[PDB]
Amino acid sequence: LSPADKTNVKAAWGKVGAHAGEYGAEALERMFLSFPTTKTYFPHFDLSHGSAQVKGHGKKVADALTNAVAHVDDMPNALSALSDLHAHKLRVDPVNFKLLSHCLLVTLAAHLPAEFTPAVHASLDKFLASVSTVLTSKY
């Protein structure tokens, strides 16, 4: 990531703040309704609106993205355990990282209108593309 993209990502994610866990839950809900093939990965979850488990898993996805922002420079080593889970154990199809990234971008657009510029949009896409690259790096 370029110095300008790091500054733009930190600006945007700063303003998300204490609502990150809530936005992580909305992104997972949007993905399951819009791309219903992704549901085959959560057969052990209640995937109805306001499910305790989806709220629970929203916080886990958000805390991991906050970590990735604090370690943007050493992402491969910050997420290396999550790269093992998603490739080796779970066997997640790489195409599915692009569907969740799109659903996160739709969630931030809807909550942060003032912050979601063309410039900031572009930098957040590169950032989520970087996070997806690491999470599929055991392939």
Binding site: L33, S34, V106, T107, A109, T117, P118, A119, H121
Partner: protein, 145 residues
Amino acid sequence: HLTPEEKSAVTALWGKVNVDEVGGEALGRLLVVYPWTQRFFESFGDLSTPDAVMGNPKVKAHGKKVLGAFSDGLAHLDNLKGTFATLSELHCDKLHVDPENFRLLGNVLVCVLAHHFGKEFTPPVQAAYQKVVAGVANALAHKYH
């Protein structure tokens, strides 16, 4: 492929779309977020920075034509292959645009609708709009298949 409550929600929101500005915001965002797409719009002029792209008057003007094509698609959801036969020929035989880029403009359009409607752009509304844009991308891709 849209339930009755879907088609009503899609239509209801569309009517409130600023037709002058949404199509130019979506075409502008395609060109900034996915820069390889700028080589097909060489003759539109200055696309050197994000602020050049959004304010470029040819981009705004052409953005209205794209949004018009989408409205025409929404009117004919049961016959999209027939509505976009001429445009598919343009993009596929003449301009040689990879069909993956059609999916990228559809997804960028969904981002822009969420930017403008915020809370109203609910997950069930988003899911109806994804089927539509997938519908349009597959119809523009027909002359490859």
